[PDB]
């Protein structure tokens, strides 16, 4: 791509500069360039990739929600096609970013990921971006998109349970997001609550094994699980 | 709800 | 441009939707499209144009400052050309946006602006965008850019003083920004302080003429003048 | 400093 001529190390360096500057679109482009070099990503690099795209898509999701709501209120005086047009524009751009991320995961991050930490990380991402596609899906394929999210989260969950301690932050964040998928996308609030509780409880029981810094890392995501449980019960 |  | 096929009224409507969604890049593009229809802008429309570009360029300025500082610290271990390259990239994009705004003002907003409210508004904008160009200028032409900002602010000031009450918000905001130009760009802190004080004092003396809502509008910008005076003295 |  447009980053083809830049050194991998330079792209990573610039991704970090872009993060410091809160330039997430640039950060994402730098990391896409780095992935397209064809080498596996390190832990730190994977995190840079995730943060970049999470922020980009996060902004798009927030704007889509503002627009979709304005649209819904318009469909309860006639304002013409503009609200629908502009929501569609934002939606299409969001879909594009999700397709780009899914493309990177498929070519060829997931297939080269052998260690649990990387494989779970990339499958969670795959679940997340199909979840974002699901949030805006209304055509026939809402179901298949939902199943694609579910399948990726499930594979990640199966690996995480076999290969990671209950306090592992990736495992915790995966469970958090799969529990959100159940509640918000799959119309399965009981499953969401059950998942969040079991995850929280099993992590608590394993905190005794951790260093002070790991304990801080694990308890943080645990608090997000607790926050959801409080909202949902 | 919150995600990570 | 790319907005050529969209109705002027649709562009304005979408600019307002983009504002609600905090999509300022889109908002700016919609308003650029509206300007390029060739009709004068209303007060509300002028404000939409200003807000859109202020937010776009504001983000670019904030990122440039983060990068320029990292760069300065690098020039006090050798990290290679990356920090300079990426600062230059952001700088060039910022310059581009400023040139676009200045182009709209020159083709043909300023020339068709006859009323004080519009003419002062557009000349202040012209001062502001040359000020942003000045903030990143280091070549020979820093001086000419600074003079271009100064000339535009001065013309706006001369009109505002003759045609607007001292509490008029455009007049107040112009004086605020010209006082910032003096302090931050022209190395004239005394002039900045004198301008901010005189402006504040003359506005205070005219508050008695205002309705409750105008008083609120005027006092707000007055508070920004006061804040600067407190920082500067 | 503050601008508008
Ligand atoms: C990449 C950017 C920076 C800001 C440098 O780092 C992001 C963060 O990267 C790591 O944290 C990850 C991580 C996050 C942490 C929960 C953040 O924690 C703190 C203390 O701020 C959120 C991030 O988005 C990130 C990278 C993502 C995930 C998520 C990825 O899904 C595919 C699953 C859960 C979580 C894991 C991977 C976390 O380990 C680190 O452990 C964090 O450091 C600390 C102090 O805990 C650091 O803030
Ligand atoms: C265009 C966007 C929206 C958010 C709809 O309006 C922006 C704002 O537009 C108007 O305010 C202008 C205005 C601003 C006000 C000081 C905001 O005041 C409040 C109460 O929030 C800041 C804006 O950036 C804007 C448009 C810009 C300028 C600036 C333009 O330079 C060329 C000179 C000073 C100031 C003038 C033009 C203000 O009149 C209005 O008077 C404001 O309404 C109130 C309640 O005071 C509204 O918030
Ligand atoms: Mg491998
Ligand atoms: Mg005219």
């Amino acid at each position: 791509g447009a980053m083809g001529s830049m050194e991998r190390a330079s792209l990573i360096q610039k991704a970090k500069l872009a993060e410091q500057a809160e330039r997430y679109e640039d950060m994402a482009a730098f990391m896409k360039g780095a992935v397209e070099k064809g080498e596996e990503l390190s832990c730190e690099e994977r995190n840079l990739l995730s943060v970049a795209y999470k922020n980009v898509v996060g902004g798009q999701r927030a704007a889509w929600r503002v627009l979709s709501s304005i649209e819904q209120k318009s469909n309860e005086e006639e304002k013409g096609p503009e609200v629908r047009e502009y929501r569609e524009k934002v939606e299409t751009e969001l879909q594009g970013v999700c397709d780009t991320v899914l493309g990177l995961l498929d070519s060829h991050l997931i297939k080269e990921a052998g260690d649990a930490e990387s494989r779970v990380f990339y499958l969670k991402m795959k679940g997340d971006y199909y979840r974002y596609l699901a949030e805006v899906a209304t055509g026939d394929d809402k179901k298949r998109i939902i199943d694609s999210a579910r399948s990726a989260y499930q594979e990640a969950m199966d690996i995480s349970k076999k290969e990671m301690p209950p306090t592992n932050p990736i495992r915790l964040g995966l469970a958090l997001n799969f529990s959100v998928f159940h509640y918000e996308i799959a119309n399965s609030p009981e499953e969401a609550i059950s998942l969040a509780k079991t995850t929280f409880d099993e992590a608590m029981a394993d905190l005794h094994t951790l260093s002070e810094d790991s304990y801080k890392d694990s308890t943080l995501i645990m608090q997000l699980l607790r926050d959801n449980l409080t909202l949902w019960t | 709800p919150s995600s990570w």
Side-chain angles (χ1 to χ4, degrees), chain A residues 192-196 198-211 213-215 217-218:
Chain A
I193 291 162
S194 290
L195 179 56
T198 279
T199 303
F200 182 96
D201 293 346
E202 287 158 30
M204 175 76 34
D206 186 59
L207 288 177
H208 73 271
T209 67
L210 301 184
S211 77
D213 290 356
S214 290
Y215 182 91
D217 288 337
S218 292

PDB file of all heavy atoms in Angstrom, chain A residues 192-218, unseen atoms left out:
ATOM      1  N   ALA A 192     -25.161 -13.257  29.025  1.00  0.00           N
ATOM      2  CA  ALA A 192     -24.227 -12.152  29.300  1.00  0.00           C
ATOM      3  C   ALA A 192     -23.911 -12.018  30.770  1.00  0.00           C
ATOM      4  O   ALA A 192     -22.756 -11.845  31.148  1.00  0.00           O
ATOM      5  CB  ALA A 192     -24.812 -10.841  28.803  1.00  0.00           C
ATOM      6  N   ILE A 193     -24.954 -12.064  31.600  1.00  0.00           N
ATOM      7  CA  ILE A 193     -24.803 -11.951  33.040  1.00  0.00           C
ATOM      8  C   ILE A 193     -24.011 -13.164  33.586  1.00  0.00           C
ATOM      9  O   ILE A 193     -23.086 -13.004  34.381  1.00  0.00           O
ATOM     10  CB  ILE A 193     -26.178 -11.808  33.699  1.00  0.00           C
ATOM     11  CG1 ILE A 193     -26.756 -10.452  33.330  1.00  0.00           C
ATOM     12  CG2 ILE A 193     -26.101 -12.034  35.200  1.00  0.00           C
ATOM     13  CD1 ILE A 193     -28.249 -10.376  33.561  1.00  0.00           C
ATOM     14  N   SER A 194     -24.383 -14.369  33.153  1.00  0.00           N
ATOM     15  CA  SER A 194     -23.695 -15.596  33.591  1.00  0.00           C
ATOM     16  C   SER A 194     -22.212 -15.581  33.243  1.00  0.00           C
ATOM     17  O   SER A 194     -21.351 -15.951  34.042  1.00  0.00           O
ATOM     18  CB  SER A 194     -24.384 -16.811  33.010  1.00  0.00           C
ATOM     19  OG  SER A 194     -25.636 -16.967  33.644  1.00  0.00           O
ATOM     20  N   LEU A 195     -21.902 -15.121  32.033  1.00  0.00           N
ATOM     21  CA  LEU A 195     -20.527 -15.055  31.604  1.00  0.00           C
ATOM     22  C   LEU A 195     -19.738 -14.046  32.433  1.00  0.00           C
ATOM     23  O   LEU A 195     -18.630 -14.334  32.898  1.00  0.00           O
ATOM     24  CB  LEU A 195     -20.432 -14.764  30.117  1.00  0.00           C
ATOM     25  CG  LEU A 195     -18.990 -14.668  29.601  1.00  0.00           C
ATOM     26  CD1 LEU A 195     -18.145 -15.896  29.894  1.00  0.00           C
ATOM     27  CD2 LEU A 195     -19.031 -14.432  28.089  1.00  0.00           C
ATOM     28  N   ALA A 196     -20.312 -12.854  32.632  1.00  0.00           N
ATOM     29  CA  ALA A 196     -19.618 -11.812  33.375  1.00  0.00           C
ATOM     30  C   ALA A 196     -19.377 -12.260  34.829  1.00  0.00           C
ATOM     31  O   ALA A 196     -18.303 -12.050  35.376  1.00  0.00           O
ATOM     32  CB  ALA A 196     -20.397 -10.513  33.333  1.00  0.00           C
ATOM     33  N   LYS A 197     -20.366 -12.887  35.441  1.00  0.00           N
ATOM     34  CA  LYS A 197     -20.226 -13.353  36.825  1.00  0.00           C
ATOM     35  C   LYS A 197     -19.180 -14.458  36.991  1.00  0.00           C
ATOM     36  O   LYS A 197     -18.345 -14.382  37.858  1.00  0.00           O
ATOM     37  CB  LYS A 197     -21.575 -13.812  37.389  1.00  0.00           C
ATOM     38  CG  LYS A 197     -21.589 -13.972  38.897  1.00  0.00           C
ATOM     39  N   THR A 198     -19.292 -15.479  36.188  1.00  0.00           N
ATOM     40  CA  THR A 198     -18.349 -16.568  36.248  1.00  0.00           C
ATOM     41  C   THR A 198     -16.914 -16.062  36.014  1.00  0.00           C
ATOM     42  O   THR A 198     -15.986 -16.435  36.702  1.00  0.00           O
ATOM     43  CB  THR A 198     -18.738 -17.652  35.212  1.00  0.00           C
ATOM     44  OG1 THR A 198     -19.772 -18.467  35.774  1.00  0.00           O
ATOM     45  CG2 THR A 198     -17.579 -18.499  34.849  1.00  0.00           C
ATOM     46  N   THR A 199     -16.772 -15.197  35.039  1.00  0.00           N
ATOM     47  CA  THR A 199     -15.454 -14.648  34.750  1.00  0.00           C
ATOM     48  C   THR A 199     -14.896 -13.849  35.910  1.00  0.00           C
ATOM     49  O   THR A 199     -13.754 -14.003  36.279  1.00  0.00           O
ATOM     50  CB  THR A 199     -15.532 -13.762  33.478  1.00  0.00           C
ATOM     51  OG1 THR A 199     -16.028 -14.538  32.388  1.00  0.00           O
ATOM     52  CG2 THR A 199     -14.170 -13.219  33.132  1.00  0.00           C
ATOM     53  N   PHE A 200     -15.716 -12.991  36.466  1.00  0.00           N
ATOM     54  CA  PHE A 200     -15.306 -12.174  37.615  1.00  0.00           C
ATOM     55  C   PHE A 200     -14.906 -13.075  38.792  1.00  0.00           C
ATOM     56  O   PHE A 200     -13.837 -12.889  39.388  1.00  0.00           O
ATOM     57  CB  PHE A 200     -16.409 -11.227  38.042  1.00  0.00           C
ATOM     58  CG  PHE A 200     -16.017 -10.331  39.188  1.00  0.00           C
ATOM     59  CD1 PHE A 200     -15.563  -9.063  38.947  1.00  0.00           C
ATOM     60  CD2 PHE A 200     -16.079 -10.784  40.493  1.00  0.00           C
ATOM     61  CE1 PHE A 200     -15.190  -8.238  39.970  1.00  0.00           C
ATOM     62  CE2 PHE A 200     -15.695  -9.946  41.543  1.00  0.00           C
ATOM     63  CZ  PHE A 200     -15.253  -8.682  41.267  1.00  0.00           C
ATOM     64  N   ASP A 201     -15.739 -14.073  39.103  1.00  0.00           N
ATOM     65  CA  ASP A 201     -15.531 -14.918  40.277  1.00  0.00           C
ATOM     66  C   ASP A 201     -14.263 -15.776  40.172  1.00  0.00           C
ATOM     67  O   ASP A 201     -13.506 -15.919  41.129  1.00  0.00           O
ATOM     68  CB  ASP A 201     -16.772 -15.768  40.548  1.00  0.00           C
ATOM     69  CG  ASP A 201     -17.980 -14.937  40.979  1.00  0.00           C
ATOM     70  OD1 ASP A 201     -17.857 -13.739  41.340  1.00  0.00           O
ATOM     71  OD2 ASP A 201     -19.105 -15.472  40.948  1.00  0.00           O
ATOM     72  N   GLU A 202     -14.008 -16.299  38.978  1.00  0.00           N
ATOM     73  CA  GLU A 202     -12.864 -17.150  38.726  1.00  0.00           C
ATOM     74  C   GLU A 202     -11.588 -16.315  38.740  1.00  0.00           C
ATOM     75  O   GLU A 202     -10.536 -16.788  39.156  1.00  0.00           O
ATOM     76  CB  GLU A 202     -13.074 -17.955  37.449  1.00  0.00           C
ATOM     77  CG  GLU A 202     -14.111 -19.046  37.685  1.00  0.00           C
ATOM     78  CD  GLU A 202     -14.794 -19.552  36.438  1.00  0.00           C
ATOM     79  OE1 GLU A 202     -14.175 -19.546  35.343  1.00  0.00           O
ATOM     80  OE2 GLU A 202     -15.969 -20.011  36.580  1.00  0.00           O
ATOM     81  N   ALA A 203     -11.687 -15.051  38.326  1.00  0.00           N
ATOM     82  CA  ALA A 203     -10.531 -14.172  38.373  1.00  0.00           C
ATOM     83  C   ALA A 203     -10.231 -13.826  39.842  1.00  0.00           C
ATOM     84  O   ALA A 203      -9.091 -13.839  40.283  1.00  0.00           O
ATOM     85  CB  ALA A 203     -10.742 -12.918  37.515  1.00  0.00           C
ATOM     86  N   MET A 204     -11.249 -13.464  40.606  1.00  0.00           N
ATOM     87  CA  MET A 204     -11.041 -13.154  42.014  1.00  0.00           C
ATOM     88  C   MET A 204     -10.285 -14.251  42.727  1.00  0.00           C
ATOM     89  O   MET A 204      -9.374 -13.984  43.465  1.00  0.00           O
ATOM     90  CB  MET A 204     -12.401 -12.992  42.705  1.00  0.00           C
ATOM     91  CG  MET A 204     -12.327 -12.792  44.198  1.00  0.00           C
ATOM     92  SD  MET A 204     -11.813 -11.125  44.616  1.00  0.00           S
ATOM     93  CE  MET A 204     -12.572 -10.204  43.294  1.00  0.00           C
ATOM     94  N   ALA A 205     -10.683 -15.478  42.490  1.00  0.00           N
ATOM     95  CA  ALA A 205     -10.101 -16.625  43.145  1.00  0.00           C
ATOM     96  C   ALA A 205      -8.633 -16.858  42.797  1.00  0.00           C
ATOM     97  O   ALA A 205      -7.932 -17.606  43.480  1.00  0.00           O
ATOM     98  CB  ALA A 205     -10.933 -17.871  42.865  1.00  0.00           C
ATOM     99  N   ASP A 206      -8.142 -16.232  41.705  1.00  0.00           N
ATOM    100  CA  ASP A 206      -6.777 -16.435  41.220  1.00  0.00           C
ATOM    101  C   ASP A 206      -5.873 -15.206  41.479  1.00  0.00           C
ATOM    102  O   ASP A 206      -4.663 -15.233  41.218  1.00  0.00           O
ATOM    103  CB  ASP A 206      -6.843 -16.743  39.708  1.00  0.00           C
ATOM    104  CG  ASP A 206      -5.489 -17.114  39.084  1.00  0.00           C
ATOM    105  OD1 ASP A 206      -4.879 -18.099  39.541  1.00  0.00           O
ATOM    106  OD2 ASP A 206      -5.062 -16.435  38.082  1.00  0.00           O
ATOM    107  N   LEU A 207      -6.454 -14.133  42.007  1.00  0.00           N
ATOM    108  CA  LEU A 207      -5.699 -12.919  42.288  1.00  0.00           C
ATOM    109  C   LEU A 207      -4.524 -13.188  43.243  1.00  0.00           C
ATOM    110  O   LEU A 207      -3.503 -12.495  43.199  1.00  0.00           O
ATOM    111  CB  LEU A 207      -6.602 -11.821  42.852  1.00  0.00           C
ATOM    112  CG  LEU A 207      -7.588 -11.154  41.901  1.00  0.00           C
ATOM    113  CD1 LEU A 207      -8.423 -10.160  42.675  1.00  0.00           C
ATOM    114  CD2 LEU A 207      -6.840 -10.493  40.762  1.00  0.00           C
ATOM    115  N   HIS A 208      -4.666 -14.192  44.116  1.00  0.00           N
ATOM    116  CA  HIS A 208      -3.645 -14.438  45.145  1.00  0.00           C
ATOM    117  C   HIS A 208      -2.294 -14.815  44.541  1.00  0.00           C
ATOM    118  O   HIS A 208      -1.261 -14.700  45.200  1.00  0.00           O
ATOM    119  CB  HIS A 208      -4.120 -15.514  46.135  1.00  0.00           C
ATOM    120  CG  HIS A 208      -4.110 -16.904  45.582  1.00  0.00           C
ATOM    121  ND1 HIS A 208      -5.185 -17.452  44.909  1.00  0.00           N
ATOM    122  CD2 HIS A 208      -3.150 -17.858  45.597  1.00  0.00           C
ATOM    123  CE1 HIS A 208      -4.880 -18.679  44.530  1.00  0.00           C
ATOM    124  NE2 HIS A 208      -3.665 -18.958  44.958  1.00  0.00           N
ATOM    125  N   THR A 209      -2.309 -15.280  43.290  1.00  0.00           N
ATOM    126  CA  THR A 209      -1.115 -15.717  42.601  1.00  0.00           C
ATOM    127  C   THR A 209      -0.318 -14.597  41.988  1.00  0.00           C
ATOM    128  O   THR A 209       0.789 -14.863  41.532  1.00  0.00           O
ATOM    129  CB  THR A 209      -1.460 -16.692  41.457  1.00  0.00           C
ATOM    130  OG1 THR A 209      -2.175 -15.993  40.430  1.00  0.00           O
ATOM    131  CG2 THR A 209      -2.281 -17.853  41.945  1.00  0.00           C
ATOM    132  N   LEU A 210      -0.875 -13.380  41.959  1.00  0.00           N
ATOM    133  CA  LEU A 210      -0.329 -12.275  41.196  1.00  0.00           C
ATOM    134  C   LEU A 210       0.572 -11.357  41.978  1.00  0.00           C
ATOM    135  O   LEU A 210       0.362 -11.143  43.169  1.00  0.00           O
ATOM    136  CB  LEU A 210      -1.459 -11.459  40.617  1.00  0.00           C
ATOM    137  CG  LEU A 210      -2.401 -12.257  39.702  1.00  0.00           C
ATOM    138  CD1 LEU A 210      -3.427 -11.311  39.109  1.00  0.00           C
ATOM    139  CD2 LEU A 210      -1.681 -13.000  38.599  1.00  0.00           C
ATOM    140  N   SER A 211       1.549 -10.784  41.269  1.00  0.00           N
ATOM    141  CA  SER A 211       2.290  -9.610  41.704  1.00  0.00           C
ATOM    142  C   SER A 211       1.408  -8.371  41.842  1.00  0.00           C
ATOM    143  O   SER A 211       0.279  -8.333  41.346  1.00  0.00           O
ATOM    144  CB  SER A 211       3.393  -9.307  40.691  1.00  0.00           C
ATOM    145  OG  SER A 211       2.825  -8.679  39.547  1.00  0.00           O
ATOM    146  N   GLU A 212       1.917  -7.361  42.538  1.00  0.00           N
ATOM    147  CA  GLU A 212       1.172  -6.124  42.702  1.00  0.00           C
ATOM    148  C   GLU A 212       0.723  -5.464  41.380  1.00  0.00           C
ATOM    149  O   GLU A 212      -0.368  -4.946  41.286  1.00  0.00           O
ATOM    150  CB  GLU A 212       2.027  -5.138  43.495  1.00  0.00           C
ATOM    151  N   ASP A 213       1.580  -5.487  40.375  1.00  0.00           N
ATOM    152  CA  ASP A 213       1.235  -4.888  39.082  1.00  0.00           C
ATOM    153  C   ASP A 213       0.256  -5.728  38.254  1.00  0.00           C
ATOM    154  O   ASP A 213      -0.594  -5.207  37.571  1.00  0.00           O
ATOM    155  CB  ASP A 213       2.481  -4.666  38.287  1.00  0.00           C
ATOM    156  CG  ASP A 213       3.351  -3.560  38.856  1.00  0.00           C
ATOM    157  OD1 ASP A 213       2.949  -2.899  39.831  1.00  0.00           O
ATOM    158  OD2 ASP A 213       4.449  -3.351  38.319  1.00  0.00           O
ATOM    159  N   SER A 214       0.391  -7.036  38.331  1.00  0.00           N
ATOM    160  CA  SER A 214      -0.547  -7.897  37.636  1.00  0.00           C
ATOM    161  C   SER A 214      -1.911  -7.763  38.286  1.00  0.00           C
ATOM    162  O   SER A 214      -2.912  -7.715  37.607  1.00  0.00           O
ATOM    163  CB  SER A 214      -0.062  -9.331  37.694  1.00  0.00           C
ATOM    164  OG  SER A 214       1.088  -9.521  36.890  1.00  0.00           O
ATOM    165  N   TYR A 215      -1.919  -7.739  39.611  1.00  0.00           N
ATOM    166  CA  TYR A 215      -3.154  -7.576  40.364  1.00  0.00           C
ATOM    167  C   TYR A 215      -3.854  -6.311  39.932  1.00  0.00           C
ATOM    168  O   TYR A 215      -5.052  -6.327  39.725  1.00  0.00           O
ATOM    169  CB  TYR A 215      -2.812  -7.548  41.853  1.00  0.00           C
ATOM    170  CG  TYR A 215      -3.951  -7.438  42.816  1.00  0.00           C
ATOM    171  CD1 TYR A 215      -4.553  -8.571  43.319  1.00  0.00           C
ATOM    172  CD2 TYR A 215      -4.395  -6.205  43.262  1.00  0.00           C
ATOM    173  CE1 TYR A 215      -5.584  -8.486  44.225  1.00  0.00           C
ATOM    174  CE2 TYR A 215      -5.432  -6.110  44.165  1.00  0.00           C
ATOM    175  CZ  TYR A 215      -6.020  -7.258  44.641  1.00  0.00           C
ATOM    176  OH  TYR A 215      -7.052  -7.192  45.541  1.00  0.00           O
ATOM    177  N   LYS A 216      -3.113  -5.212  39.810  1.00  0.00           N
ATOM    178  CA  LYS A 216      -3.689  -3.964  39.301  1.00  0.00           C
ATOM    179  C   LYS A 216      -4.265  -4.128  37.883  1.00  0.00           C
ATOM    180  O   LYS A 216      -5.391  -3.696  37.632  1.00  0.00           O
ATOM    181  CB  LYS A 216      -2.644  -2.851  39.313  1.00  0.00           C
ATOM    182  N   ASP A 217      -3.515  -4.793  36.991  1.00  0.00           N
ATOM    183  CA  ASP A 217      -3.958  -5.025  35.624  1.00  0.00           C
ATOM    184  C   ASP A 217      -5.246  -5.827  35.559  1.00  0.00           C
ATOM    185  O   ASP A 217      -6.135  -5.519  34.772  1.00  0.00           O
ATOM    186  CB  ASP A 217      -2.901  -5.771  34.804  1.00  0.00           C
ATOM    187  CG  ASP A 217      -1.681  -4.918  34.458  1.00  0.00           C
ATOM    188  OD1 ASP A 217      -1.752  -3.666  34.435  1.00  0.00           O
ATOM    189  OD2 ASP A 217      -0.645  -5.541  34.182  1.00  0.00           O
ATOM    190  N   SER A 218      -5.303  -6.913  36.334  1.00  0.00           N
ATOM    191  CA  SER A 218      -6.469  -7.810  36.334  1.00  0.00           C
ATOM    192  C   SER A 218      -7.706  -7.162  36.984  1.00  0.00           C
ATOM    193  O   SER A 218      -8.807  -7.200  36.412  1.00  0.00           O
ATOM    194  CB  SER A 218      -6.122  -9.105  37.052  1.00  0.00           C
ATOM    195  OG  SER A 218      -5.171  -9.854  36.316  1.00  0.00           O
TER     196      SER A 218
END
